[PDB]
Amino acid sequence: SKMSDVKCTSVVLLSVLQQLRVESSSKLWAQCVQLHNDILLAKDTTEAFEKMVSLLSVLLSMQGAVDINKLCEEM
Amino acid sequence: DRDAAMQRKLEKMADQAMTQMYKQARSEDKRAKVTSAMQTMLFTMLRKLDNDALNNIINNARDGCVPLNIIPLTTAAKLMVVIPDYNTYKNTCDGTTFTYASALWEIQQVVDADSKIVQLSEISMDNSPNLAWPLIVTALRA
Amino acid sequence: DRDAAMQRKLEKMADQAMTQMYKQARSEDKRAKVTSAMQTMLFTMLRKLDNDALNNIINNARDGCVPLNIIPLTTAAKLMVVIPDYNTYKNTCDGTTFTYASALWEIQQVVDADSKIVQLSEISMDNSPNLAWPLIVTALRA
Amino acid sequence: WDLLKYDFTEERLKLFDRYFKYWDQTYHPNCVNCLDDRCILHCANFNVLFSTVFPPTSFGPLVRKIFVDGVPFVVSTGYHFRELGVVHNQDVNLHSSRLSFKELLVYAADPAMHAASGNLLLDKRTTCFSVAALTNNVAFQTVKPGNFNKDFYDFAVSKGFFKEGSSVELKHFFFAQDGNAAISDYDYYRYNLPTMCDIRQLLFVVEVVDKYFDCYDGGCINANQVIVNNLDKSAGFPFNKWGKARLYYDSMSYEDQDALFAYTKRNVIPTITQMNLKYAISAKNRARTVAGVSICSTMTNRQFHQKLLKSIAATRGATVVIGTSKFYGGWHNMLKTVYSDVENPHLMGWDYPKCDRAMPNMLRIMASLVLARKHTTCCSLSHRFYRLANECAQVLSEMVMCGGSLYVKPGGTSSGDATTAYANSVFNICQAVTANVNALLSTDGNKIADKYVRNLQHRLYECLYRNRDVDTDFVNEFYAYLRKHFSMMILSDDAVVCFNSTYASQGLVASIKNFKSVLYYQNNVFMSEAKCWTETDLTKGPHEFCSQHTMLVKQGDDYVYLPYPDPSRILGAGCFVDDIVKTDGTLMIERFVSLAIDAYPLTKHPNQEYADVFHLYLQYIRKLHDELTGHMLDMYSVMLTNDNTSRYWEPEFYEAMYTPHT
Amino acid sequence: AVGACVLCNSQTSLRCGACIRRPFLCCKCCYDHVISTSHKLVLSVNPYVCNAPGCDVTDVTQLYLGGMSYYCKSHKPPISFPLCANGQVFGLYKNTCVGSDNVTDFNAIATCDWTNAGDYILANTCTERLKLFAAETLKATEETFKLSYGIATVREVLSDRELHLSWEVGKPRPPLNRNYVFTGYRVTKNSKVQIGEYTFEKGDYGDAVVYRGTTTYKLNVGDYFVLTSHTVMPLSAPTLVPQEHYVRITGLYPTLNISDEFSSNVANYQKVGMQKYSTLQGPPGTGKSHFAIGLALYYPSARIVYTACSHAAVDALCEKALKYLPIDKCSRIIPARARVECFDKFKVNSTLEQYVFCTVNALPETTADIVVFDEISMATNYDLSVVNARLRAKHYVYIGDPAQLPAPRTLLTKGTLEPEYFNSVCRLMKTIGPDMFLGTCRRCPAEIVDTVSALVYDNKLKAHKDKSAQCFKMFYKGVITHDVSSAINRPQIGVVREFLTRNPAWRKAVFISPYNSQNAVASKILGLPTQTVDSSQGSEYDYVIFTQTTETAHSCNVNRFNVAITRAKVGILCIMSDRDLYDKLQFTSL
Ligand SMILES: Nc1ncnc2c1ncn2[C@@H]1O[C@H](COP(=O)(O)OP(=O)(O)O)[C@@H](O)[C@H]1O
Ligand SMILES: [Mg+2]
Ligand SMILES: [Zn+2]
Ligand SMILES: [Zn+2]
Ligand SMILES: [Zn+2]
Ligand SMILES: [Zn+2]
Known part of the structure; x- marks a missing residue:
């Protein structure tokens, strides 16, 4: 049941990117929206992950916006 | 019965003051704690997916090895990732191969913080302290 | 008991009518505010009118009726061209001066999507992808 | 051409005397000279051809410089419609002193001030004519993604949904949009074209459509009888900056609200309409735009049309089924008033591709005429014509404010005025009858063995082309023919047709292919046969009407039709919520109750994975209430006193919701 | 409000x-506190309250509790529930209130009036939330004690700038210095409007x-000035962020061969890069x-x-x-009021710069890299909470000395505070030892550092300098004035003005006497640059003239x-009052 988990996680990820105020950088927001739309309209599992990676590396690319060190520490 | 009807009216008013207060307090708590609950939910789901590339980029991003642009997917496309420590360099760079996002990339250009190009020969454990270390590796997808 | 019931209904009626009076006072106080704001907007838009060329073309008209679609086209001092990509920008406003609507315009400013000013020398074919697209180019009449 | 030449009457008459020289009927270019509501379709249709040879910068409002207490304004005193020609006002307040609220509203709504006091825009993103740019920077608007209801998703994967290979899956999501959505959707008005509809055929399809609209009644109503359904909605471009529609419905008394309506029966009010992006769950990524019409147009369209728009939405058992509730055994009554004793039924459904953008201007004028034929007594003729011009300047060809810039909308109905669904219903019935007329004429004639039908075709041709005035005997006979062999059901473009099979096979009634041809030469689009369905049976109902499939269940003792939604849209509405406070769940039980009501008929579906959705919503409402009383027993110290949520998790309530009693 | x-x-x-500070309390804790x-x-x-x-x-x-209101026993409704009952007090979330046995410390903190040393040592050995609450209520008590000062009604207007005042008897007169402000009031039988904010200074004469x-x-005769109080706002951030050692340096990028003088500090720079916070x-x-300056140089990529x-x-x-770091990344933020003279050589009030300098109270809410807190001994737990609430950072350095004079703590009057209870960081220093430690004076010559190693510092200093023969002592008493309880010694000022010529190299010397009124007096008679001892401790001067006014506890x-003497870079003349203090150091006799 892992296909319909990537679709929702992309919605959460784009919500996080929007809350980080990435709407300002229009070149970045166009790519994030395109990745989100192509994740949701994806009927194949591997392509969904290969686009989820590109979407996530937008979130990781912001040094002083999120705190990945604390967030992953709860594992 | 007049007394009991008045008391019942007061009890119903107390219930209407219970529910409205509850679903105002919960509403303001949910709407005032959205910037962090969303992120914690996202990383809970990211642990739940249990993929390879997602774990690879997250585990590298804990150790300061973030990418400076969106990871491309097309063959022979460019990616500039910072490597901030020699320990974060020993794990990903093997020869001219660069393991990232569960894919192999070819290293093109390694530039230190002073932006001057440094070849792969100069990256040695003895010579590691002698560089302004937060390297940017510009690589291409293989 | 008859007196008490009549008094209670009287107080209910009086506090219903005072509620209505509060509502009508608020309504008539909002109407005046909206009227003042509308008159302010109309007189400011009057102040922005270019009363020389516009008056010239109106006094040049048949009955003083000019179609609205040519009121900007012959009198607007500012021209905001919006360009989606470099291929159009080459063919619509190349250089610092271009001709549109049979009058000569000179570039005054070029901004990108997120409103960060871009100098005209950066709009090159090789430098096209790095720009934030559609470019609002603001020009003035000459 | 001279940029200031708006009165193009002489060139139009020269064209008409060069090309259509021996055309019998007269032709008065300015349609304000016309005689009734069937010399307006004629002259309007002629103009919609003759106005593709004149420059496109000389249409729209006609401004003029007036003086208000010694200060010079520029205001719109007319219009030059492409279809209706030149229209001048009759109340031009040159040299006014004081502006009341009505005059202030009129001079704030119309775009003469806004376009005159703006910078000239040259937008290469679109192909529509771009009139002006009000601000100094074009504003880009995005659509943020929906918020996730994670508790419901974990509860859904707990009950076994969302597997690999399941027949119920998440397809309806909250798609996001980049900066260039709002202007790359308005660009779809390039699909509109100036189309000259046939003019001896429209003047008979108007008769048949009007016969379809003969039961209802209406007319001009006063200000104090107008019923506003909802008041906290925005009020177009120049008015949203100060308050919602409540402010303009409260600030104006009834006297200066009837004064406005009696002012637009003798003037023309051009009107900006804003275009916003809707934020709602949808199955495909194209951005959806809704056109907010300014309160200066709604406040009169409601008053002019409300009696008819309430008589249509309160009459049950007719062709335009708008206002027949699908609950309470209302769907079965619809589906039994479709099968109005036709011979060998087959159900047919079509779908107009780009219906609200590619609809030709002539059919919008046709809809606004047949929807305004009821005013035979309340208002005069010129009043009806200025109401038609105001509808065609505030709906059809208006100034669209699309992200901080006034463009000109070339045509096609906006989806936000007062008469939208009903105007689309009239247009839809017009296309259905036009397909029928084409199918009946275009038959070989010698193969039509049924000797009554051949005589009907031989009279149909005569009433179409060889007869100038109405023929009410034949129109009545043909409309009885249509309701005998082409029984129809309309919800604004969602149609179901119960056409006799033998007649369609012989060609004496409109099959699908006739609708493809009619949409080709009248709607200017191509309705590919992969999106218009045909059901050859009746024990399974229409395939898809109003986006709710139909199935035949056994209730009580007898068989009734039940409407069930696409059982993925319900899950999509559960898992995704457009506002973050709706994620909390325990606040929203009165939302899952509504979803369960809408999704109850999935219980009786023969498939099981469909049937489990209703039990998912029931168990989820029960768990939501359990955790709600848990939190209201921890937070306070006492349980709720009169708790009445013990029926929302019982299927008897939802089953009562689909029973024929109330 | 939950x-x-x-x-x-x-x-x-x-x-x-x-x-006074109105803290939240759980139900069990509230019962144990009100009982x-x-x-x-x-x-x-x-x-x-009884709603009757x-x-x-x-x-x-x-x-x-009855119906939907509360009543006493006299207005008790027929159906009523007692609030204080069975070990709890009725309130929300009654079933999930886990009790605590730490109610004695909370009672003692919220009850005591912050006068004896027991309250302060209770305010530094408690838990984190109790630390914050104690500091906040101490600040509130200081504000309310400030509110109890007198009202200054004028008698006549001497000049456009000079005023003759009279304070209302029955309340002590606040001392006259630059910190205290007043709001003026004009009473003309109506319209009591704030006529302005005024700061007062004692005049040169009279x-x-x-x-x-x-x-x-x-100003007219009827105007009167009332002291203004600042509403102390509550704090949330902990006093000390939890320490988390790192295996390798994160958030920093070291630079090889920064300089030669910073050679011995490289290991400590790496240690500061290692730990989350360090002392x-x-x-x-x-x-x-x-x-800290060399630390800034060693990690130039750190804001x-x-x-x-x-x-x-x-x-x-x-x-x-400015002496070491490159200038064009440094800013000096001053507050909006800024009634005291700041340092105007950097781009003033530039938050966006890389090297931002600020007072604790004027810090802007920002993210940052490694943040250096200076003179922790001068600061209380309110200051540490403020700096930890406004600046979110990846490395914290706290530099300062417990041996110096602490925060004033005007409420404290009986008993003396041990050093280790100054605040949380000084307690950290005196419990487990400093994370970095360096003792050898690069500031003062040999005799002064020898004396201070005979003083409070048990002899440990090994300063790299020699006796410059520029350290001088005096003994004469002088006369006390007791102006506003801030004494001024006019004959000592006169003797300093007398000296002033026989050794012309001391004409650039800097005046040191705590005694803010005497510090202001010194600006007139001899005109030397002057500084009180408390606003000192962080600066240094080549020649220092120190004047001990009174043999008081202060x-x-x-x-x-x-801390007054150890600012002397090359020389100091101290005129002493106490026989024992003067005899305890070894300068020239004079
Ligand atoms: N290694 C060194 N080389 C040269 N001068 C030094 C060295 N270490 C310290 N100093 C001098 O000692 C002084 C100490 O200053 P500072 O740190 O302000 O003292 P404190 O911390 O007591 O206020 C500095 O002005 C500096 O010039
Ligand atoms: Mg120091
Ligand atoms: Zn009418
Ligand atoms: Zn507690
Ligand atoms: Zn009482
Ligand atoms: Zn207390």
């Missing part, structure tokens, strides 16, 4: 309203007040502030906020940065004398 208990961090909606102390007023979402209009009973031990006003209104303790003039408790301390930090504290 929240977390300040004793056990449970969800609750009670607030013990008798406390013991005289706190007999509990605020729920609406106050617990003809009653005033507020104690929660006897109030009964009972005169020189006023500086925001407004330019002419540096050293004797005065041992490079502690200059260590560093230097912050300090004092004003001239952060100004001296700015001066040292200007004879060994810490204050040590």
Whole structure:
């Protein structure tokens, strides 16, 4: 049941990117929206992950916006 | 019965003051704690997916090895990732191969913080302290 | 008991009518505010009118009726061209001066999507992808 | 051409005397000279051809410089419609002193001030004519993604949904949009074209459509009888900056609200309409735009049309089924008033591709005429014509404010005025009858063995082309023919047709292919046969009407039709919520109750994975209430006193919701 | 309004309203607090008072809930529930309030009036939430004590700038210095409007007040000035962020071969890069502030906020940065008021710069890299909470010395504070030892550092300098004035003005006497640049003239004398009053 988990996680990820105020950088927001739309309209599992990676590396690319060190520490 | 009807009216008013207060307090708590609950939910789901590339980029991003642009997917496309420590360099760079996002990339250009190009020969454990270390590796997808 | 019931209904009626009076006072106080704001907007838009060329073309008209679609086209001092990509920008406003609507315009400013000013020398074919697209180019009449 | 030449009457008459020289009927270019509501379709249709040879910068409002207490304004005193020609006002307040609220509203709504006091825009993103740019920077608007209801998703994967290979899956999501959505959707008005509809055929399809609209009644109503359904909605471009529609419905008394309506029966009010992006769950990524019409147009369209728009939405058992509730055994009554004793039924459904953008201007004028034929007594003729011009300047060809810039909308109905669904219903019935007329004429004639039908075709041709005035005997006979062999059901473009099979096979009634041809030469689009369905049976109902499939269940003792939604849209509405406070769940039980009501008929579906959705919503409402009383027993110290949520998790309530009693 | 208990961090909606700071309390904790102390007023979402209009009973031990309101026993409804019952007090989240046994410390903190040393040592050995609450209520008590000062009504207007005042008898007169402000009032039987904010200074001669006003209104006889109080806002951030050692340096990028003088500090720079926060303790003039400068140089890719408790301390930090650090990334933020003279050489009020210098109270809410707090001894737990709430950062350095003089703590009058209870960081320094430690004076010559190693510092200093023969002593008494309880010694000022010529190299010397009134007096008679001892401690001067005014408990504290003398770069002349203090150091006799 892992296909319909990537679709929702992309919605959460784009919500996080929007809350980080990435709407300002229009070149970045166009790519994030395109990745989100192509994740949701994806009927194949591997392509969904290969686009989820590109979407996530937008979130990781912001040094002083999120705190990945604390967030992953709860594992 | 007049007394009991008045008391019942007061009890119903107390219930209407219970529910409205509850679903105002919960509403303001949910709407005032959205910037962090969303992120914690996202990383809970990211642990739940249990993929390879997602774990690879997250585990590298804990150790300061973030990418400076969106990871491309097309063959022979460019990616500039910072490597901030020699320990974060020993794990990903093997020869001219660069393991990232569960894919192999070819290293093109390694530039230190002073932006001057440094070849792969100069990256040695003895010579590691002698560089302004937060390297940017510009690589291409293989 | 008859007196008490009549008094209670009287107080209910009086506090219903005072509620209505509060509502009508608020309504008539909002109407005046909206009227003042509308008159302010109309007189400011009057102040922005270019009363020389516009008056010239109106006094040049048949009955003083000019179609609205040519009121900007012959009198607007500012021209905001919006360009989606470099291929159009080459063919619509190349250089610092271009001709549109049979009058000569000179570039005054070029901004990108997120409103960060871009100098005209950066709009090159090789430098096209790095720009934030559609470019609002603001020009003035000459 | 001279940029200031708006009165193009002489060139139009020269064209008409060069090309259509021996055309019998007269032709008065300015349609304000016309005689009734069937010399307006004629002259309007002629103009919609003759106005593709004149420059496109000389249409729209006609401004003029007036003086208000010694200060010079520029205001719109007319219009030059492409279809209706030149229209001048009759109340031009040159040299006014004081502006009341009505005059202030009129001079704030119309775009003469806004376009005159703006910078000239040259937008290469679109192909529509771009009139002006009000601000100094074009504003880009995005659509943020929906918020996730994670508790419901974990509860859904707990009950076994969302597997690999399941027949119920998440397809309806909250798609996001980049900066260039709002202007790359308005660009779809390039699909509109100036189309000259046939003019001896429209003047008979108007008769048949009007016969379809003969039961209802209406007319001009006063200000104090107008019923506003909802008041906290925005009020177009120049008015949203100060308050919602409540402010303009409260600030104006009834006297200066009837004064406005009696002012637009003798003037023309051009009107900006804003275009916003809707934020709602949808199955495909194209951005959806809704056109907010300014309160200066709604406040009169409601008053002019409300009696008819309430008589249509309160009459049950007719062709335009708008206002027949699908609950309470209302769907079965619809589906039994479709099968109005036709011979060998087959159900047919079509779908107009780009219906609200590619609809030709002539059919919008046709809809606004047949929807305004009821005013035979309340208002005069010129009043009806200025109401038609105001509808065609505030709906059809208006100034669209699309992200901080006034463009000109070339045509096609906006989806936000007062008469939208009903105007689309009239247009839809017009296309259905036009397909029928084409199918009946275009038959070989010698193969039509049924000797009554051949005589009907031989009279149909005569009433179409060889007869100038109405023929009410034949129109009545043909409309009885249509309701005998082409029984129809309309919800604004969602149609179901119960056409006799033998007649369609012989060609004496409109099959699908006739609708493809009619949409080709009248709607200017191509309705590919992969999106218009045909059901050859009746024990399974229409395939898809109003986006709710139909199935035949056994209730009580007898068989009734039940409407069930696409059982993925319900899950999509559960898992995704457009506002973050709706994620909390325990606040929203009165939302899952509504979803369960809408999704109850999935219980009786023969498939099981469909049937489990209703039990998912029931168990989820029960768990939501359990955790709600848990939190209201921890937070306070006492349980709720009169708790009445013990029926929302019982299927008897939802089953009562689909029973024929109330 | 719900929240977390300040004793056990449970969800609750009670607030013990008798406390000045009004803290949240869980139900069990609220019962244990109102059962013991005289706190007999509990605020729920609406106050617990007898809602019958003809009653005033507020104690929660006897109030009964009825209908939807609360009543005493006299107005008790037929159906009523006692609030104070079975070990709890009725309130929200009643079933999930986990009790705590730490109610004794909370009672003692919220009950005591911050006068004896027991209250302060109770305010530094408690838990984190109790630390924050104690610091906040101490600040509130200081503000309320400030509110109890007299009202200054003028008698006549001497000049456009000089005013003659009279304070209302029955309340003590506040001392005249630049910190205290007043709001003026004009009573003309109506229209009591704030006529301006005025700061007062004692005049050169006579009972005169020189006023500086925001407004330019002419003063009349009827105008009176009232002291203004600042509403102390609550704090949330912990006093110390939890330490988390790192295996390797994160958030920093070291630079090879920064300089030669910073050679011995490289290991400590790496240690600061390692830990989340670190502490540096050293004797005065041992490079502690200059260590932070070399730390800034060693990690040039780090947006560093230097912050300090004092004003001239952060100004001296700015001066040292301008001496070493490159100038065009440093900014010096001053407040909107800024009634004291700041340091104007950097781009003033530039938050966006890389090397941002600020006072604690003027810090802007920002993210940052490694942030250096200077002179931790001068700061209390309120300051540490403020700096940890406004600046979110990846590395914290706390530099300062416990041996120096602490924060004033005007409320404290009986007993003396041990050093280790100054604040959380000084307790960290004196419990487990400093994370970095460097003692050798690079500031003062040999004789002064030898004396200070015979003083409070048990002999450990090994300063790298020789006896410059520029250290001088005096013994004569002088006369006391007791102006506003800030004494001034006119004959000592006269003798300093007399000296002043026989050794012309001391004409650039800097005047040191704590005694802010005498510090202002010194600006007139001899005109030397002057500085009080408290606004000192972080700057240094080549020649220092130190004047001990009175043999009181204030200007004879060994810490204050040590921190006054150890600013002498090359030389100091100290004119002493106490026979024992003068004899305890070895300068020339004179
Ligand atoms: N290694 C060194 N080389 C040269 N001078 C030094 C060295 N270490 C310290 N100093 C001098 O000692 C002084 C100590 O200053 P500072 O750190 O402000 O003392 P404190 O921390 O007591 O205020 C500095 O002004 C600096 O010039
Ligand atoms: Mg120092
Ligand atoms: Zn009418
Ligand atoms: Zn208390
Ligand atoms: Zn507690
Ligand atoms: Zn009482």
